[PDB]
Amino acid sequence: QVQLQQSGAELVKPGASVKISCKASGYAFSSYWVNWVKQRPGKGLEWIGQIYPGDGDTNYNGKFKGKATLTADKSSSTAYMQLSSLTSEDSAVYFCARSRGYFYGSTYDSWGQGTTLTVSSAKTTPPSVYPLAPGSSMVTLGCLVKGYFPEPVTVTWNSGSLSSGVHTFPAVLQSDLYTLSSSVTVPSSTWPSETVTCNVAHPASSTKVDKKIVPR
Amino acid sequence: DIVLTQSPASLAVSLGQRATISCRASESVDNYGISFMNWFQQKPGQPPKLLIYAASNQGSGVPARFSGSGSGTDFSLNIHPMEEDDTAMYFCQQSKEVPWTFGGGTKLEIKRADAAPTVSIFPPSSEQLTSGGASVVCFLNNFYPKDINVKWKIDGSERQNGVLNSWTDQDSKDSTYSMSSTLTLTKDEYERHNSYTCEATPIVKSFNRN
């Protein structure tokens, strides 16, 4: 199938540059424009520019001229976007997207998954992971993932096999550190007679933690 | 540049009913009878997904409950019948003139019957106490409508400092909302009090520090 796969999240200090990639598969990469789009954490969508990989021609939004540089590598079917002289205003999710011809309103019809850029001088900090058991017919358990930077973390229950009855809440930022929580609700016949475990990964600090939820 | 203005910014619609979202452009987004107006849906953590291209054409795989109308500067997206998984952000977009631009977005949510939260309160973990901190966590899960008030009490007195709240986006299956509220104290402050209460407005859950 038609697919665009983007590079991973990056944390960079103000003043640096970064280059994000978008690898295409499932179609003739040279023949369709590749577009780049910015979405600020809680905001709308802005078009940065586009490149035609077959010949390297680019059209830019003037708002991003001298901030963004678009290139392409035909041989590996990969488009690149470099962002320079970075500031906190560049912290955002960036998407690549294939667009179609005028027969299709020149619409986007395939998107990469997004790459999150964090531009900050704050220091990478791993989470503390705290299991939440009741003070003690359904029982709710929790996992508090406190004091990490940058985003994201990944939280699962029982290595992902416990997926129903879960709520994982958006992180909150305070004093350059994030905190989030996750709840899981299970039948009382399944805990603590059976085991429930919170699994947390924080890729930016190369940390993985498993904490069983132990009855009190 | 072409500015796209969406109306309304937020909309709530009942299951089975019709949602209409409007997009007005500062200048025409058509030429030669072709429209360069496109509509997208975006769910949390995902890229936008095409619904309607060139004003009125369903994208590949897009259901007939989505339709588009308009020409020149005036466009609209219709969804009928509304379904639970249609809770999402919706954007119009024009590809007529570089730079391509998007509307500001419309948050479309589903109406349903009111539901009280399932409330759970948790003392600080022993692990956190060994490092000198004490977070008390309260979950208020699967409620409707989204507007809810959480109140903390310590030994009977309302407590507002040290509280941080987070809300989920509307559930795509049951149309409810959930929230977490965390009260963070030092270990020494936590150990100075006995009863900790979380209230939803009330539904009350408490524990006593033992």
A-chain CB neighbours of B210 within 8 Å are 135
DSSP annotation of A204 reads G
Q: Is the dihedral of CA A28, A29, A31, A36 positive or negative?
A: positive
In angstroms, this model's resolution equals 1.5
Cis peptide, bond prior to residue A127, ω within 30 of zero: no
* Interface contact flag, A45 B91, Cβ < 8 Å: yes
Q: To which residue do tokens 């379904």 refer? A: B83
Q: Cα–Cα distances in Å, from B133 out to A130, B129, B167?
A: 11, 5, 24
C-alpha of B40 from chain center = 17
Nearest chain A residue to B168, by CA? A169
State the SS3 of chain B: CCCEEEECCEEEEECCCCEEEEEEECCCCEECCEECEEEEEECCCCCCEEEEECCCEECCCCCCCEEEEEECCEEEEEECCCCHHHCEEEEEEECCCCCCEECCCEEEEEECCCECCEEEEECCCHHHHHCCEEEEEEEEEEEECCCCCEEEEECCEEECCCEEEEECCCCCCCCCEEEEEEEEEEHHHHCCCCEEEEEECCEEEEEECC
In this structure, how many other beta carbons lie within 10 angstroms of the beta carbon of residue A32? 20
In whole angstroms, give the CA distance from residue A140 to residue A184: 6
HSE, side-chain direction, 13 A CA sphere, residue B38: 27
- Answer for the pair A156, A166: CB distance below 8 angstroms, yes or no: no
**List of residues 6+ apart from A164 with CB closer than 8 A:** none
Give the number of beta-carbon pairs within 8 Å between A and B: 144
- How far B140 CA lies from chain A's nearest CA (Å)? 10
Beta strands A108-111; A115-119: pairing state: unpaired
- The tokens describing B64, both together, are 């007939």
A188 conformational bin, left if phi > 0, alpha if psi -120 to 50, beta if neither? alpha
Each domain of chain B, given as residue ranges in start order, spans 4-111, 118-208
- The tokens describing A149, both together, are 């930077």
Beta bridge partners of B135: B184
* Interface contact flag, A104 B54, Cβ < 8 Å: yes
In whole angstroms, give the CA distance from residue B97 to residue B57: 20
Q: Is the dihedral of CA A34, B108, A116, B99 positive or negative?
A: positive
Which residue in A95, A105, A179 is closest to B53 by CB distance?
A105
Beta strands A68-73; B4-7: pairing state: unpaired
Burial of A38 (0-12, 13-18, 19+ CB in 10 A): buried
Do domains B4-111 and B118-208 share one topology? The answer is: yes
Walk me through the domains of chain A, giving residue ranges and CATH numbers: 3-119 (2.60.40.10), 128-213 (2.60.40.10)
Residues 57 to 86 of A: which have CB under 8 A from any B CB? 59-63
Burial of A28 (0-12, 13-18, 19+ CB in 10 A): exposed
- How far A106 CA lies from chain B's nearest CA (Å)? 6
Which residue in B50, B98, B104 is closest to A44 by CB distance?
B104
Q: What is the topology classification, in CATH, of domain B4-111?
A: Immunoglobulin-like (2.60.40)
Identify the CA nearest to B181 among candidates A126, A149, A183, A198: A183
- How far B56 CA lies from chain A's nearest CA (Å)? 10
Mutate to test the interface with B, among A106, A164, A182 (most CBs of B within 10 A): A106
Q: Is A44 on the interface with B (CB under 8 A)?
A: yes
In whole angstroms, give the CA distance from residue A83 to residue A171: 26
In this structure, how many other beta carbons lie within 10 angstroms of the beta carbon of residue B46? 12
- Answer for the pair A34, A96: CB distance below 8 angstroms, yes or no: yes
In whole angstroms, give the CA distance from residue B115 to residue A205: 40
Q: Cα–Cα distances in Å, from A110 out to A81, A148, B125, B128?
A: 17, 33, 45, 45
* Extended strands (E) in A7-157: 10-12, 18-25, 34-39, 45-52, 57-60, 68-73, 78-83, 92-99, 108-111, 115-119, 128-132, 138-148, 154-157
- Answer for the pair B169, B88: CB distance below 8 angstroms, yes or no: no
Q: To which residue do tokens 């901030």 refer? A: A67
Q: Cα–Cα distances in Å, from A20 out to A17, A78, A82?
A: 10, 10, 6
- The tokens describing B27, both together, are 């200048």
* Interface contact flag, B167 A108, Cβ < 8 Å: no
Q: What is the dihedral of CA A66, A33, A19, A153, to 10 degrees?
A: 120
SS3 A30: helix
Q: What is the topology classification, in CATH, of domain B118-208?
A: Immunoglobulin-like (2.60.40)
In whole angstroms, give the CA distance from residue A146 to residue A42: 22
Q: Is A52 on the interface with B (CB under 8 A)?
A: no
Residue A114, H or E segment: none
* Interface contact flag, B47 A128, Cβ < 8 Å: no
Identify the CA nearest to A162 among candidates A135, A139, A134: A139
Q: Is the dihedral of CA B18, B104, B58, B110 positive or negative?
A: negative
Which residue in A46, A104, A167 is closest to B141 by CB distance?
A167
**List of residues 6+ apart from B194 with CB closer than 8 A:** B155, B208, B209
In this structure, how many other beta carbons lie within 10 angstroms of the beta carbon of residue B83? 14
Chain breaks in chain A (C to N over 2.5 A) after: 136
Cα angle value A45/B44/B112 (rounded, 5°) = 120
- The tokens describing B72, both together, are 């020149």
